[PDB]
Each structure stands twice: as C-alpha cells, then as structure tokens.
Symmetry: C4
Subunit: 201 residues, 4 copies
Amino acid sequence: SPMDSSRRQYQEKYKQVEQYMSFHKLPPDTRQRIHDYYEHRYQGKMFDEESILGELSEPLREEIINFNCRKLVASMPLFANADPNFVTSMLTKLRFEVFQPGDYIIREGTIGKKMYFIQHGVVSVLTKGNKETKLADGSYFGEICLLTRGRRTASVRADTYCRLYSLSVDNFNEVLEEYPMMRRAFETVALDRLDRIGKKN
Amino acid sequence: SPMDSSRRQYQEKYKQVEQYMSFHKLPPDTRQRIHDYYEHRYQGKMFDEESILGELSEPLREEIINFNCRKLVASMPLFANADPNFVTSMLTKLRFEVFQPGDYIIREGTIGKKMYFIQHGVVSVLTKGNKETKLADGSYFGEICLLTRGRRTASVRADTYCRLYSLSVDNFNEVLEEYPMMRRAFETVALDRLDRIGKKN
Amino acid sequence: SPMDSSRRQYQEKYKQVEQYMSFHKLPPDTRQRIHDYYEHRYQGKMFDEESILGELSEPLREEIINFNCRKLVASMPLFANADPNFVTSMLTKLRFEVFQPGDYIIREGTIGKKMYFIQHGVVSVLTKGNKETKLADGSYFGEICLLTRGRRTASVRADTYCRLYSLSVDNFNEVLEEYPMMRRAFETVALDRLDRIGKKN
Amino acid sequence: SPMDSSRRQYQEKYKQVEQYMSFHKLPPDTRQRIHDYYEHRYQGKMFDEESILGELSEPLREEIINFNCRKLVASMPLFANADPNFVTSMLTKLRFEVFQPGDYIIREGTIGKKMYFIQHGVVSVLTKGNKETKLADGSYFGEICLLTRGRRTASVRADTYCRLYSLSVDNFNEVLEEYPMMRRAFETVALDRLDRIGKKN
Ligand SMILES: Nc1ncnc2c1ccn2[C@@H]1O[C@@H]2COP(=O)(O)O[C@H]2[C@H]1O
Ligand SMILES: Nc1ncnc2c1ccn2[C@@H]1O[C@@H]2COP(=O)(O)O[C@H]2[C@H]1O
Ligand SMILES: Nc1ncnc2c1ccn2[C@@H]1O[C@@H]2COP(=O)(O)O[C@H]2[C@H]1O
Ligand SMILES: Nc1ncnc2c1ccn2[C@@H]1O[C@@H]2COP(=O)(O)O[C@H]2[C@H]1O
C-alpha cells in the first residue's frame, strides 16, 4: 500500500531530491540518471534498514540477511563452500550499493578501501593494454588492493545496472583475522587474476 | 494509554517492521519469531532510552538504573558484595538485550567482544565433550574471552526467553582499570569454570 | 508563546519522561527530583542547541557564547584577565550541566575526565579529615585530576541547585597545548589547593 | 514553491533560531547579523545535503558536485590544470561555509585545521607590519599551516560576504598522500607567499 510509511517515505524523500536538483539547476540527463537510480535502488520504498535491524537481536539479524543473500551465497563458490559462520560474519558487514551502465565502480591507480560482490548485473574489467574480462552474478572484485594495500590494478566499469554488496577494508581484515584460511582463498584467486593481465606480487 | 507517544511509537515502528518483512518476503516462522521478539523486548512501548537518560544529570542517571537493576545486583554475589561505585560504574555501561529459545548467544571458537549478565531466563553452556552446565537469573557468562583475549571457550545457548545485560570488552576493561581488585573476582571464577570443562590459562 | 516549537517540544519531551518513569515504576521522590531537574535545567523550553549553533558560522558561534558567558568570564580572574582567544577557545568547548542539592558532582578516589566552572550555585569540597571548603559563582574545580592524571583529590557535593559548565579532559589539553602559559595558572592554584588539605605533587 | 518541504523547513528552522535568540536575549545587532547570515547562507531553503548525497551512488555524488563547482574549478589554476580525479577527490571532501564582512576567518598565531577556497567574495590578508594582500574568487588560503603544522602566518578577514569551501587538514593530507605531485604545487605557492611577507620554512 502507498499509505505504508515506507512508500510515503520514498515519495517525500524523492520530493526532497527533486527540489535539490531544482535549486542546483542540474542538467536534464543528470536529473534522469538520478530518477532512474532512485527507482532501481529503492523500488518505491524506503526503510531505515540498519535501525530496524539494529532494534533486533543478532541471531535474527543473521537469520534475516542469510535469507536475503541466499542466491548470492549459493552462486559464489568462495561463500557456498565455506564455513557459514565466516559467511555470516561477512554477510553482516556488507552494504548494498547500486550502479548504472557506464559507471566506473573502480578506477585503476586509485587507492581502494572496499571490495564488491555482484548480486545482479554484469561488469567490465579494464586494464591498459589487455583484452577485457567480464564478471557477473556470483563473482567479486576489488579484493586485490585490500590484500596488497597498493593501488587499483584495473578499472571496473558497469555494463548493466548493478546490484552489489560492498565490504570495507577494515571489515574485510576483521573477518580475515578471525578466519585466516579464507585469506588464502582470496590470495590464490587474486594471484591468478594478476597473472592473466601479466602482473605480479 | 495507547495515545502515549511511546505506545503509538511502538505501533508505528512495528508497522515499519511488518513492511520490511513483506518487502523481503520473509518466511512465516521468521516473521513469527520477530513478532514475538518485539513483544518480549519492548512490551508495547518504545522509549529513546539513552536520549532521555542523556538529557538528565549523571546522579539521576545512576539513581535510576540502580533502581532498575535492584534484583540483578542483589542476586549476584559479585555485585551484591562489592563497592557500589564499581557496581554503578558497571551498571551504567550495560546494554539490555533479549534472546529467544534456541539462540546461540555465544559460539565456541569465535572472537568475543561482550560479556553478559542474566537478569531473567535460563541458558545452556555447551562444550564439545563435556556435560552441559546451566546458568540462570543472577549469573554471568562470556567473561573468559575478555580476560584472556583468546576465543570463546563454549557455546552458550538460550533455553528460555532471556532478558540480559551486555557489557562490551572496552567498558569491561575501563571499569577494571579503575577497580583492579574486581579483576581478581572474575579471574578466580573464570579459572574455576575452565577447570571443570578440563581446560587451562 | 507555548505554540513555539521549543515550548511544545519541552512539553512533549517531558511527556516522554513521565511515561518512562511510569514504565519503570520509579519512586515518588525520584520522580519529583527529575521533575524539578527538568524545570531548573530547561526552563520550559528545549532547543537543539548545538545543531542551531552548528548551522551558524564560527564567528557568530563565538560571539553568541561570549555574550552568554559574560558574567562567568568577568567573575573569574583566570578568564577575566586572560587573552580572549584562549577564553573563547575554552568557552566554545564547554557543556552546560545542572545539579541538585546533595548530588556528588565528584567522588574522591575516582578517575576524572572533566573539570567544572560554576556559573551559579554553591558547592562543598570534602576531604576525609579536613574541614570543608566552599566554592560558588566564579570558581572552578576538578582541574587537579586533569593536570596530574591521577584520581580525584576530594569529593565535591552540591549545596544548592547548580548551573555549571563542564570541560572534558581532551578539550582541556587541546586548549592548553595551544595556550601553554595558561597551564601555569591552573598549576599554581592547583598546588595551593593541595597544600591546604595537606597533600603534594 | 513555499509548500516545498525545503522552504517550509527553512521557515521552521529559522523560527527555532528566533526563539533561541529570544531566550538568550541577544542584542539587536547580533540578531540582525544572524538573520542576514541565514539568508546569504541558505537562501530560503534547507536541504539535508549530505543525507541526499549520501543516498546516491558515488559517481552521481561526483558528477553533481563537479557540476556545482564548475566556476570554482575553472577559475583556479591549481584545479583547472590538474588531473580531474584529484580535483574530484578534493571536491568531494569540501564543506560550504559563509562569512560576513568583518569576520576573522583566520587569526594569526592560532592552530589551523582547515584551508579555504574562495568561490565568491573578497578577503584580506593581514600580517603585523606588512601591507595588506587581497584574495578573491578563484584563490585559496590557509594552506600554509597544513603544510608546516605550525601556526597561522596571517589573519584573514572577510571584506564582503564570502561563499567559501573549507577542507580539513586530515582530508587535505589524505588527498595529498594519494596525489603527491600536487603537494608541490601548494608548496611552491606557499613559499612564494611567505617570501613576500618576509618569512621562511
Ligand atoms: N584477470 C582478472 N579477472 C577478473 N578480475 C580482475 C582481473 C584482474 C584484476 N581484476 C580485478 O580488478 C580489480 C581492480 O581493483 P583491485 O582492488 O585491484 O581488485 C582487482 C580485481 O578484483
Ligand atoms: N564450567 C562452566 N560453568 C559456567 N560457565 C562456563 C563454564 C565454562 C565456560 N563457561 C562460560 O562459557 C563462556 C563462553 O564464552 P567465554 O568468553 O569463553 O566465557 C565463558 C564462560 O562464561
Ligand atoms: N583546598 C581546596 N580548595 C578548593 N578546591 C579544592 C581544594 C582541594 C581540592 N579541591 C578541588 O577538589 C577537586 C576534586 O577533583 P580534582 O580533579 O582532584 O580537582 C580538585 C579541586 O578542584
Ligand atoms: N603573501 C600572501 N599572499 C596571499 N596569502 C597569504 C600570503 C601570506 C600568507 N597568506 C595566507 O595567510 C594564511 C594564514 O593561514 P595559513 O594556514 O598560514 O595560510 C596562509 C596563507 O594562505
């Protein structure tokens, strides 16, 4: 129902957005991109996700988000085949993020402070002077910078609208100091991914 | 009265919860668990507890929560027989938490960042290959990890609905750097509890 | 006017308080103490002081609070005779606090993380085995712990309702690392105050 | 429209301000200065700028503020001629601030934790015993303290109403650890500016 505080919320908040756009005299293409983002991202409803989750117990918090990430976990070998407690620990630190076609999720050469899991959408991995590798539902990227603490080893550009979950470097490390055999699984893959664009260490 | 902003609040916030459940298409058992949590936890009323407490002076803050924790303090030798200022200092750092039958309050082997005091309810302490010890009103658990900085030495599972107060590791230490003879009282007991599931140090 | 959002606010928020008191079944003396605090502290009006101040420029922020602390600054030699920029720097870090007759603003032997300036009210300084010194409008206390980093050297108990400004240890140090000749003025006095209850260093 | 939640917001919030002024019995000149600030700063509309921006993706966040800072970037050689990614990185860390004629944006001799970019307005740089240098649209100041970590090397006083963007020292460094050749461009200029008021290092 539209009388749901959560749909009425979406409408009022989108109203705020329109006036901000109007105050700053944003171009029409930029206004359309935002409108479209707002629909893909929120889908007519706004929740105070983390305050609602925050009001619950941790087991319910865990149970809920496991339920929500069922396809993501089962599509992703790293997750699907791991200890659930590690999986849960990751899952509860993730932040949902949407991107639009054309967006540079990551720029090569920059400093990186999050990695990403692809729930839905297709993305492009772009190195200066290699062909282009694609990643879709059930893969992740942006992990290399977190392991090395250097710079981004590629740009990553959205082909489609993307529904992603991001993980901060501090959470990534926190989960890996508690689950160290999982560090290796990211390393193996990260080396393989470097090898192929002809790089090392 | 239901016209009390605090009952009207409970109703509106529970409405939010229902719509969140609906958006994410949660199973019925999971919806019932949450409904039931919400009733045991809040009891038809929501307060901004720490903002109301935050608006008061510290002595009133102290007086109030002492009043509220009277049965807890008097049921618990560690508290009942201590210096009230230490007791007050602990009490003002606690966070109320509810759990449901079946919940793993603590999982063995994980990293722990809070201990717990049992105001109401009964819990089960579960070590791989020992019998099962029970704890109820007036005991605490989860202190061992805080003292050692290692991992959880047992799982702890709720038998009943549990009304608990949690204490973070940083607060635990803060209160113990100011009240060091109380460190010992946790140590003595913590050693005794290790002894019995056949462990050490 | 009572239609002022700030008086209507005081009334609604005090309503919240009454229901909290009712939920937790607070004794009548404790309910009266809180009622009375709420009137002395807020005086029928609630402002989001720091959000309103936060929306302004720093010079206006500074100008305002200087205006408000005029009697305090001019009653207090340390402030009255200092560099205004130091005074301003202190003033902008203060937090208004009210206390009631009987309250222990400070307990001897505890760890201290704020000092206090007396705008209005009279207080009692109590050392085990000395007579009792009184402080009123235009003095400060609780500075000794901040200078030494040891424990409280006295209890301090409110005789009257007290209108005070508190300063955290971190702000105290921040202002003193920038204004080091003012450190001395607190030291001189702090030594004199120790001398008299027969203590040192 | 005035029915826009953002204009209604400005009106309600300005109402709050008036009552605060009234409670604290502010002088008329001080009330007029604030009224006038509120109009130059907000212009009849209040947005939750960073919450709206916070709800969007980073690329949209970036695109928007680039659009908004177009004249600032193109008026300022340091920005205009740099790598956009550095520019974007700076731009997204800026905080809009307004000042009034007469205001001391910076006092010589104090500790500094932000620098400033002038979008609109004219300012005065004042050293004890030199003539006075003026800066307007398209310059910046307050960078010297950030580079040296010493004290302010001048007072800076607003001649006109000023629309400025501030950058905190921590953000300044963060952007410069990632873009180190830009450190030099601030150094060169900062040395030149010292030279001229007859100073060094
Ligand atoms: N060959 C590959 N296949 C898939 N992904 C690949 C490569 C090479 C790099 N990458 C990703 O690019 C990302 C850019 O940010 P990163 O933090 O370097 O992590 C990198 C990897 O996740
Ligand atoms: N024998 C015992 N009796 C009661 N409680 C016991 C034992 C042994 C461990 N424990 C608790 O299990 C908890 C698991 O988390 P912990 O942080 O290891 O603290 C432990 C104790 O509080
Ligand atoms: N002789 C004195 N006259 C006035 N105030 C005095 C003394 C001795 C201690 N004190 C205050 O007690 C305070 C207790 O907290 P403190 O942080 O030790 O600072 C002390 C002084 O401000
Ligand atoms: N000669 C100059 N021309 C323009 N600006 C000048 C000078 C000398 C100092 N300054 C500015 O004063 C500022 C005071 O704070 P600061 O942090 O020292 O940075 C200084 C410079 O930005």
